[PDB]
Design a protein around this ligand. Structure first.
Ligand code: AMP
Ligand code: AMP
Ligand code: CA
Ligand code: MN
Ligand code: MN
Ligand code: MN
Ligand code: MN
Ligand code: MN
Ligand code: MN
Lengths: 321, 319
């Protein structure tokens, strides 16, 4: 239930599979690799897996190839990081009824689906929890491990810009940089790694932009054919919803993205007060008060936009009251 | 010359004018207001001034109205922050050699134009120097002052993305947030304040973009008439050169900007290794190894662009 019990369970087991969530982000990659590498330094037999393509922005990160898509492994323990429910880990959820499982996560809506669960939403990033676990295990950090652990703290705080960038976040980043974390390398690879094609794709996003409530709600969409027409992928749209929120006067931005055909992810970002986690949660997704998402499969975009935006607008009007 | 001597000079004077650089950035606003408010806590009478319009993105920051354009004041001491040469403070350079002056700056190209000069280019932001000065003066921070001092560290590091964001930068950021600096407020005011016209302007920047040296060099330009066509000013283009550097494979991005008519500001940003301060300095400007600029007036943009590109390509191939 707490960190101490997790540390004991990790110490008790040797053959460990560490799994992150599908559609992985920086915190998923950071948490998976930092924990995997920490456990390996203890002499454990460990593999790492995510049931999803690892985005190209991570390709130069040290040990990125340790994260597998199709591991061949007979683990004694499954460790699930940064994933709020079983569906979030893809095909590895079939191991949950077969292999003892640890959950380490910072989502308030975590269903506590492990045999042991350490869930604390006061952390901005699961990577902060892995940091503390590794230290409690006696893991010695080198600069590569510091860099990998810094990654998740940076990405989940929007590089120290989001409402979750509190004193403990800054303290953790300070400690990791002191230990050799390459903060410039992480920013360059995540933020300064844009294919030029992303600009034309985003212009198409701007052209489709709809505004509601005196400009406080902004939403747009990318259909799958538009991805292909622009030689782009959902890896190319990753920062777009944040760019929509950066428009003056916008309080909540919503981006609907169809990739691949028939799979529609909708990203929600809010600025000052509106809880998008409650909207996403009620729609079957989840996240955090200022950043949340839900994924639909087998539905048509003309049907997804009304359902999401109508529910969003309902809650948004209730919030203004 | 060092901080201790500067602190002693500041303590010896009770009527002080603090001045920042023209075309102010977050570090300028942060350093000017942080030092002004710190000195006021010692009971001194302090005015703050910049000979330029304060950008709209600062207008919700606490005490921003303390920065004046036309202060009426008879100071005993002039303190110039974050400014590498007299030209950089506009009309307040007329006070040099009339009011004893202190320079506090982090530019390697600083000409040492004060009576006392503490210049240390190892700092990512002048705001870090002001933070240390306020602590040495015995100032106690509240959350508004911490926010004001955090601002310059954040903007001069590109919100912790530039290569100057070292352990001391993160130590200072941590200590200021511990004292109540509102890191989220700062990021939203500076970065989430974009006019729609800003996106239309950037599209024409993209339409003019050129890549050189196999995609390692990116440059574009905005002429004055294009600002007017999109109902924009230099405030709207402020983050554009950073957006050009974020293109994959680009090592140096350069943006030529004519605003107002007949004034050309050339902005440079580099990623991994190219010393743009050398290029800008040799052209009459200055800055840092990864961020520098130069301003021309009375020159034609069609003659400025080829000459600057020519010099940049020469320096790029050297080292
Ligand atoms: N399909 C989903 N189910 C549950 N939570 C999600 C989902 N998609 C996104 N989230 C959460 O929302 C955050 C950001 O939203 P997004 O950018 O839309 O993925 C993530 O870091 C997750 O915590
Ligand atoms: N006219 C100028 N003279 C000297 N340095 C400049 C000038 N303009 C910009 N810089 C430097 O370039 C850096 C980036 O600002 P800019 O290139 O103006 O966006 C700043 O930190 C300044 O030190
Ligand atoms: Ca669900
Ligand atoms: Mn995640
Ligand atoms: Mn996370
Ligand atoms: Mn999350
Ligand atoms: Mn400055
Ligand atoms: Mn500065
Ligand atoms: Mn400067």
């Amino acid at each position: 239930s707490g960190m101490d019990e997790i540390v004991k369970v990790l110490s008790q087991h040797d053959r460990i599979l560490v799994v992150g969530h599908i559609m992985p982000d920086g915190d998923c990659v950071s948490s998976v690799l930092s924990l995997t590498l920490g456990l390996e330094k203890l002499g454990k037999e460990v593999k790492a897996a995510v049931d999803y393509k690892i985005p190209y922005v991570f390709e130069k990160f040290p040990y990125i190839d340790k994260i597998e898509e199709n591991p061949n492994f007979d683990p004694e323990l499954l460790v699930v990081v940064d994933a709020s429910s079983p569906d979030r880990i893809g095909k590895f959820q079939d191991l949950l009824d077969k292999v003892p499982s640890v959950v380490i996560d910072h989502h308030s809506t975590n269903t506590n689906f492990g045999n042991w669960n350490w869930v604390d939403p006061s952390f901005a990033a699961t990577a902060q929890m892995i940091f503390r676990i590794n230290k409690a295990l006696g893991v010695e950090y080198d600069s590569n491990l510091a860099t990998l652990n810094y990654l998740g703290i940076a990405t989940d705080t929007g590089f120290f810009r989001h409402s979750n960038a509190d004193v403990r976040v800054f303290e953790d980043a300070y400690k990791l940089v002191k230990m050799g974390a390459d903060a410039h390398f992480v920013a360059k690879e995540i933020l300064e790694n844009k294919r030029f094609e992303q600009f034309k794709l985003f212009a198409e996003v701007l052209e489709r932009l709809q505004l509601l409530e005196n400009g406080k709600i902004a939403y747009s969409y990318i259909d799958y054919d538009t991805y292909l027409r622009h030689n782009c992928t959902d890896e190319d749209s990753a920062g777009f919803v944040g760019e929509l929120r950066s428009i003056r006067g916008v309080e909540v931005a919503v981006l609907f993205m169809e990739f691949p055909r028939g799979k529609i992810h909708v990203s929600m970002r809010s600025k000052d007060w509106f809880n998008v986690n409650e909207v996403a949660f009620e729609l079957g997704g989840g996240g955090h008060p200022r950043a949340a998402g839900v994924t639909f499969e087998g539905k048509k975009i003309e049907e997804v936009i009304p359902r999401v935006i109508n529910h969003l607008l309902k809650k948004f009007k209730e919030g203004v009251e």
